[PDB]
Ligand binder design. Structure first.
Ligand code: HEM
Ligand code: HEM
Ligand SMILES: CCN(CC)CCc1cc(F)c(F)c(CCc2cc(C)cc(N)n2)c1
Ligand SMILES: CCN(CC)CCc1cc(F)c(F)c(CCc2cc(C)cc(N)n2)c1
Ligand SMILES: C[C@H](O)[C@H](O)[C@H]1CNc2nc(N)[nH]c(=O)c2N1
Ligand SMILES: C[C@H](O)[C@H](O)[C@H]1CNc2nc(N)[nH]c(=O)c2N1
Ligand SMILES: [Cl-]
Ligand SMILES: [Cl-]
Ligand SMILES: [Gd]
Ligand SMILES: [Gd]
Ligand SMILES: [Gd]
Ligand SMILES: [Zn+2]
Lengths: 401, 401
């Protein structure tokens, strides 16, 4: 009942005993594995009791005075109000834990270094925007990026939810044409149409930074222009391909996910944007080279004078590698934090070893940890992994429409 | 029924075939173990009944007299003998289905084109060797490779198994060295030691073809040398890096797995080697670049004058791509069938489409289907997949020693 886990590069063997704590059942059954799928009232107390227990064991204070006291308070709070408020230190600990528990995140070696902004006293989309602006400016830090999350008020019954409508704080417009197809980012055609619907003046470019749609409880969303000085972007050039700059490509400094639901101790935060720094394959391989994204691969290959007439020239692979080189070179020249997929996966292996000793294993989603180029060149390819759900957690949630 | 999405196009299908999945895999609702490399006459009767049903469906005779006669026949034979014998046409159908059903095979567009050699009358290790030699000759076909399987006698009560001890018919020796290292292929250290212990006089090159260790029922394994002119090989050169040829690298034409068990309608064929042709990443990325295999990546990168002191130069990715180019160029120059990972994954997408129409789905293991370099440049990266076990099947089995 404790899965054996082997690293095939070295031959080492561990057992994941932490898996025995998995709460939310995943999508797989003994008869079929669905691991490759992107998307698969007094019980609030069991999750609260559990999470409070997590907190006190973490500080070596299980079964000691303040532990018991805190247990009664949440019990009394739920009895009196049907919910409870997290202590500040508990909110901090829970945010770090939800990051630590994210099976798809290869950057979790950093999970202990996370700046948590407490926005639980927020009210109105105007307050949200100032909070989001504080976060962006702190996280960006003139290109010396710092992991951060801003936690807006939790969900309560009978009253609407705080929501950010954009999937990220920086996104880039996607405009249909005289022919359906898209100029800009095809991943954001929908929110680009929602923004224009609510009064935004669309640009014409391929890299127009979208406005924010911020939603206070039970109000229509409100458009907000982001201060252009606050959105740090990187023009893309290549160290030796002089023409690469003339392609006019750019990407933004801060990856800040703004549509996921943060769940701690049974409480739900549908507005809790978190940010870190990019792994270069996210920009260079997925965002720029996915066929349903900017799809630039063949354009770069023509410029490199590659033989695109036959797949066996590996022109796709060569063009992709140089795009990733340009992402890394450009961010480093701009002094904007970035990590290549070799360094990131080596650090994740160290993370796995740390978590083995600390908690007896680590929930990891192989298909998302292995980078989208040069998979088997990285050590995580040869590492068997066990995927399961622990709480606190970041969860996906429906769009607010 | 699981909903399956393609994220490049937006397509959506439902895998109704997974509901008929017989045997059980390693995952539960609590934890996914999809990344793990290694995951009574009444029950023999029900397996056989299901396969006969499959066979008579394929020839448009479900529910016919001949169908019922065969069901009745197999029951009578199991009652009188504890087992039964496949008809020749049933064996051919069953070998093909086992390939069709293999979730980790990207080459399955080819599944209907498989030459089946019926060696179920084989009597000894010496005759086994002759059958194997003629398989290699037919399948190699002077470089115009043809898919084939040779089926040796089934497991049966009262007698030991036929077994091929070698994992493939063509393997390079791996010699433990004087300073702990391995000369040759480190994957083959164990089988190399067994060959020496069984009378083989070892070489000391990096590409010494191993002899075959062939086991007849209730016999010790017997050593057979492959005639050197039966084993077609490809010296590796690069189309523009002329020093590459001085590495002295080679690989063989014929990938022929010889240690898997073929299961058809409850009957087990522990010796049934099958062969196809290579996908270039198997050789260029895994066999030559894995740290625990030939491990040539850094040596190639240094010769390429790449900066190997920093990961962000992507020296590993650049060297790997040119090693794969060399493999593709070398096999094409030698007129030896080979398929690149772009062509192969494109043909697998057609296979999934064919199989959705034919059977309502297709068992597929995403982590094995996605190639080990350039994953998201291929269409299969963006295809959700359902992994499950159908019979007839190829199964792993313990080593005979
Ligand atoms: C500090 C540098 C970080 C790096 C380099 C990094 C890297 C990554 C990468 C490459 C992914 C893959 C997801 C995809 O490709 O769509 C990912 C996913 C994820 N990250 Fe991290 N990350 C970082 C920080 C953070 C932080 C600070 C948080 C939260 C506090 C976080 C939470 C998550 C979650 C929940 C996912 C799952 C994505 C999904 O399911 O769509 N990450 N990360
Ligand atoms: C004709 C060209 C073929 C191509 C291009 C091809 C390709 C592949 C590749 C790339 C793999 C993954 C190998 C690995 O990394 O371990 C694989 C696995 C597999 N192939 Fe195919 N193959 C071909 C023919 C065949 C044939 C003829 C059979 C059987 C009749 C077969 C049965 C299998 C099985 C059972 C596996 C999975 C075994 C495992 O998990 O290690 N293949 N194939
Ligand atoms: C599931 C389907 N898609 C959305 C349509 C997922 C896209 C997505 C959704 C996330 F929540 C998410 F965190 C990511 C990772 C991006 C990222 C985040 C951080 C903090 C650092 C970093 N380097 N990278 C991607
Ligand atoms: C996980 C266990 N290991 C060995 C112990 C893998 C064994 C194994 C089992 C296969 F079926 C398999 F196809 C391979 C790749 C070789 C190959 C074979 C064919 C027919 C075509 C092709 N292109 N390549 C390796
Ligand atoms: C179908 C497949 O699961 C899907 O394309 C996944 C695969 N792995 C991934 N891995 C990361 N990091 N990000 C992704 O978007 C995906 N997409
Ligand atoms: C641990 C992981 O499952 C293992 O390294 C797998 C991943 N995917 C693979 N895919 C193929 N085709 N061949 C392999 O050997 C592997 N190895
Ligand atoms: Cl992104
Ligand atoms: Cl091989
Ligand atoms: Gd030119
Ligand atoms: Gd040259
Ligand atoms: Gd040398
Ligand atoms: Zn699974």
């Amino acid at each position: 009942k404790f899965p054996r886990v082997k690293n095939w590069e070295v031959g080492s063997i561990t057992y994941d005993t932490l898996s025995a704590q998995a709460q939310q059942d995943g999508p797989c059954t003994p008869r079929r594995c669905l691991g490759s799928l992107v998307f698969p009232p007094e019980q609030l107390l069991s999750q609260a009791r559990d999470f409070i227990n997590q907190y006190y064991s973490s500080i070596k204070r299980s079964g000691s005075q303040a532990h018991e006291q805190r247990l009664q308070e949440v019990e009394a709070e739920v009895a009196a109000t049907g919910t409870y408020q997290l202590r500040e230190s508990e909110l901090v600990f829970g945010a770090k834990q939800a990051w630590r528990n994210a099976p798809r995140c290869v950057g979790r070696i950093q999970w202990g270094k996370l700046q948590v902004f407490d926005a639980r006293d927020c009210r109105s989309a105007q307050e949200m925007f100032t909070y989001i602006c504080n976060h962006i400016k702190y996280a960006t830090n003139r290109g010396n990026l710092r992991s951060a999350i801003t936690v807006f008020p939790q969900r309560c019954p009978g009253r609407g939810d705080f929501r950010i409508w954009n999937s990220q704080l920086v996104r880039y417009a996607g405009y249909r044409q005289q022919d359906g197809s898209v100029r800009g980012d095809p991943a954001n055609v929908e929110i680009t149409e929602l923004c224009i619907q609510h009064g935004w003046t669309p640009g014409n470019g391929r890299f127009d930074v979208l406005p924010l749609l911020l939603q206070a409880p039970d109000e229509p969303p409100e458009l907000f222009l982001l201060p252009p000085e606050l959105v740090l972007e990187v023009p893309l050039e290549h160290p030796t391909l002089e023409w690469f700059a003339a392609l006019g490509l750019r990407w933004y400094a801060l990856p800040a996910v703004s549509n996921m639901l943060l769940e701690i101790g049974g409480l739900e935060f549908p507005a809790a944007p978190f940010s870190g720094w990019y792994m270069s394959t996210e920009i260079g391989t997925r965002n720029l080279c996915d066929p349903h994204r900017y799809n630039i691969l063949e354009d770069v290959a023509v410029c490199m004078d590659l033989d695109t007439r036959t797949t066996s020239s590996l022109w796709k692979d060569k063009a992709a590698v140089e795009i990733n080189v340009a992402v890394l070179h450009s961010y480093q020249l701009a002094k904007v934090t970035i990590v290549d997929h070799h360094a990131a996966t080596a650090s994740f292996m160290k993370h796995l070893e740390n978590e083995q000793k600390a908690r007896g294993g680590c929930p990891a989603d192989w298909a998302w940890i292995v980078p989208p180029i040069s998979g088997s060149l990285t050590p995580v390819f040869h590492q068997e992994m066990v995927n399961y759900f622990l709480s606190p957690a970041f969860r996906y949630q429906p769009d607010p429409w």
